[PDB]
Design a protein around this nucleic acid. Structure first.
Ligand SMILES: [Mn+2]
Ligand SMILES: [Mn+2]
Ligand SMILES: [Zn+2]
Ligand SMILES: [Zn+2]
Ligand SMILES: [Zn+2]
Ligand SMILES: [Zn+2]
Lengths: 162, 162
DNA sequence: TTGACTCTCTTAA
DNA sequence: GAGAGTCA
DNA sequence: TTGACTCTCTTAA
DNA sequence: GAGAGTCA
């Protein structure tokens, strides 16, 4: 089993490599009509991606290191959290982008939480619009808003009450 | 079926059968520290479910009718919206429970919207807690809250900024 | 040991 | 959140 | 014609 | 949002 020192070494080599990714400045809604700035460290669109990185899906990557002749591989956004509990309330922990930008590997833009918590950030009003996430959102969720519902609740007869 | 008359007949028959489903009262959070009452028309747990209904999944049902000697079948919650566009902005329209209760077939608890709009209601603060859905929520979403994030954004070195 | 591909899987609407 | 097939 | 089962699929995290 | 195989 990899030691804590060895894991810290993986985390450090990961940070070293990701820190050299292109840094892209994005202006983002914070909620409450305010705008803020996020700096994403974006993995390249095509190979080569950086030492240890490889693409396993359109918006999926993995980080790989070989330690004492054994190959180890992790989801590319999971590496910052290798020393954290990997489940909570019986739910698997997932890497969760506070910037909602999959290519970003900035660990200051990631948290470690259930898939439900993760998904729900998409509709959050944002840190200046009423976010109640204990680990606060960095921005308003991209899907926040009135929605585009096509048809509302309705009945033709009188069989129902709300 | 194809004709408006035939579609109205399907909707009316569906409403008549669903109108005989047991009415179950559910007290629900509305947001803002307030609570309300919903009356769900709940499909039975086991066969027989009602004329035209059959279960295709633990929480999935279908409605079927024979028109012009041909069998026509729909997802059991889609029938109220058979006269509505089946897509919006190129995204498939889905039946969406405002009461977050799958067994419920009360059309006054259903809306017709994209899967994203549908999902996002799970985290809405609710009609008295700040819901901005244009077709308003009937209750606070069951997943609204601070979440249970295990680890927040963090770095070991000094390569990153927010 | 490393890169660049390949494949399938999870969850809850 | 969906569609469709197999039997009786 | 109607009922009661079976199977796999879609989406975007 | 994930894990794992192949080949050189
Ligand atoms: Mn996310
Ligand atoms: Mn729903
Ligand atoms: Zn980012
Ligand atoms: Zn938030
Ligand atoms: Zn209901
Ligand atoms: Zn709402």
């Amino acid at each position: 089993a990899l030691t804590n020192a060895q894991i810290l070494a993986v985390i450090d080599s990961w940070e070293e490599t990701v820190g050299q990714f292109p840094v892209i400045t994005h202006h983002v809604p914070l909620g409450g009509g305010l705008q803020g700035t996020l700096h994403c460290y974006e993995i390249p669109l095509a190979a080569p991606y950086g030492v240890g990185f490889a693409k396993n899906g359109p918006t999926r990557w993995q980080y790989k290191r070989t330690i004492n002749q054994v190959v180890h591989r992790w989801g590319s956004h999971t590496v910052p959290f290798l020393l954290e509990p990997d489940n909570i309330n019986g739910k698997t922990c997932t890497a969760s982008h506070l910037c909602h930008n999959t290519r970003c590997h900035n660990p200051l833009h990631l948290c470690w939480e259930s898939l439900d918590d993760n998904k729900g950030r998409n509709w959050c009003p944002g840190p200046n619009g009423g976010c109640v996430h204990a680990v606060v959102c960095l921005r308003q969720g991209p899907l926040y808003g009135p929605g585009a519902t096509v048809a509302g609740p309705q009945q033709r007869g009188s069989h129902f009450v709300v």
